[PDB]
Amino acid sequence: MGFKVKLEKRRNAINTCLCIGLDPDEKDIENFMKNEKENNYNNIKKNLKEKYINNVSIKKDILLKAPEKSEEFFYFFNHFCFYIINETNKYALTFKMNFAFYIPYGSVGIDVLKNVFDYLYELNIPTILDMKINDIGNTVKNYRKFIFEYLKSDSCTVNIYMGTNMLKDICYDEEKNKYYSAFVLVKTTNPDSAIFQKNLSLDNKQAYVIMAQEALNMSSYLNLEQNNEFIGFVVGANSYDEMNYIRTYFPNCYILSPGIDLHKTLTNGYHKSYEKILINIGRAITKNPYPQKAAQMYYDQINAILKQN
Amino acid sequence: MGFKVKLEKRRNAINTCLCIGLDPDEKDIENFMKNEKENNYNNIKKNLKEKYINNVSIKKDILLKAPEKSEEFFYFFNHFCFYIINETNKYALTFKMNFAFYIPYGSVGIDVLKNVFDYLYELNIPTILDMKINDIGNTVKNYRKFIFEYLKSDSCTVNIYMGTNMLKDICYDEEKNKYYSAFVLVKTTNPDSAIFQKNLSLDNKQAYVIMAQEALNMSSYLNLEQNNEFIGFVVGANSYDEMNYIRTYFPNCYILSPGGDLHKTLTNGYHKSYEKILINIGRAITKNPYPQKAAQMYYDQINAILKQN
Secondary structure (H helix, E strand, O other), X not given: OOHHHHHHHHHHHHOOOEEEEEOOOHHHHHHHHHHHHHOOOHHHHHHOOOHHHHHOOOOHHXXXXXXXXXXXXXXXXXXXXXXXXXXXXXXXXXXXXXXHHOOOOXXXXXXXXXXXXHHHHHOOOOEEEEEEEOOOHXXXXXXXXXXXXXXXXXXXXXXXXXXXXXXXXXXXXXXXXXEOEEEEEEEOOOHHHHHHHOOOEEOOEEHHHHHHHHHHHHHHHHOOHHHOOOXXXXXXXXXXXXXXXXXXXXXXXXXXXXXXXXXXXXXXXXXXXXXXXXXXXXXXXXXXXXXXXXXXXXXXXXXXXXXXX | OOHHHHHXXXXXXXXXXXXXXXXXXXXXXXXXXXXXXXXOOHHHHHHOOOHHHHHOOOOHHHHOOOOOOOOHHHHHHHXXXXXXXXXXXXXXXXXXXXXXXXXXXOHHHHHHHHHHHHHHHHOOOOEEEEXXXXXXXXHHHHXXXXXXXXXXOOOEEEOHHHOOOHHHHHHEEOOOOEEOOEXXXXXXXXXXXXXXXXXXXXXXXXXXXXXXXXXXXXXXXXXXXXXXXXXXXXXXXXOHHHHHHHHHXXXXXXXXXXXXXXXXXXXXXXXXXXXXXXXXXXXXXXXXXXXXXXHHHHHHHHHHHHHOO
């Protein structure tokens, strides 16, 4: 009942700040399908035995079939995500799905995305939708409906360069009086991020500092924190200077750190409530041949730095 | 054969720079469905009877039925868009679809969007997908695939606040040796737009000015101009001062102007090749009870102001 309590409770249960990124590309699905057919559907038959696969709402008929060839891509795309979640959810404080990977095939990927979020909700695992949404206020409400109503995601990523007021139409819904969490793009992984995030300035502060300041001001205006919701910051893992600054001048804020030296990133943005520094690791786990092992490795590496801090 | 070439021929054929925005909300579909049920599906039966409806690729069986109640919403959503396109397409230089309106219901809206783009492609009408995409380079290729390959869109809107290099991954595909057009967000409609677009600055130029030149530097770098493609700007119609600066200091640009006083907007950003100043009208046409007249009305006004130039 609120993203902060759900994050707090889950953090107490598993004591890590690892966020697992599920961003399946075309190679992953064909390799998964090729591997599954070669090795007698070991993972698929384990998927079909897990409890919540019965609760997904899109094409459950097709998914629960043993291994209709128009649905072949849908079948393995959906089972690949279930396999990654089933293998690795034990080490994940949260799961972050990037919408770009589910859209390039049309509706079929949104159906998988919908199943993935339904599966994660059934598992009561906190979710983040990485869609970097941005638009004018009334148009933006369609994104809020899709993200927080259709997918029932716990939070999402936002590009507020078009204004901070859009956060009012993402993080709050007057018609149901429900509050939602968001992560705004502050400092990002690309090498040319600095052209606008850094070189732009106002009142001698850099643009990402102004954007972060603008975000938190809207968080207090909307009363998010009071309703167990928040507005957080996306800070690239490689951005050590900026990450240190954000934690220094903004403690109490939630940071989501994609693009991954792990020790430097965690120590710079550490917090006592370390669900306030989510470490996103994606391809390193999903493309690793033993995802549960790879996730367990990164789980231990992050627990080492947490106690050694 | 090229977005710049396609706009050129279509502009001379119909002599207008009107861009019609197809952004159907939930009420638009209910009102259309209520009207169709009362008047024995007058417009729906007019839609089915047009030649090009046969070239849509999703749920074609369902669409060509006359008026299984689960597909009811899909049926009227798709036919409403077909109705709007059929009524107003002869006055439109291009059609701009905003992705936000097609996603809030899950996969079902993407199926409609795909049919709308398939329908418009067959009509050889230029398209713009208003998705305001932004992401890191390799993830963004998924958007380029969705926009320019799946929907076969002619152009799209881009938020380059995360870096200009992402335009390299949108407007060009080395793997397929294809070039695409895009519109970059420069100055936008909202009242809180000024916090980052205006107040942020570098060496005393405002953020939209440096964003705009950074966008065009990537356009010249990518050789878009040679390949009959371009990178344009999204400048709000209400932003008269900024529109004035953009047209003079970057002439020969493509400008897409959503969102006042139409006369002031057009003459401020007018160009001899006036397909370089697309005028977006959405709610005024699609929510008007007589769309063809409203499209013809706005068509005549903008054709009239063109003569005073």
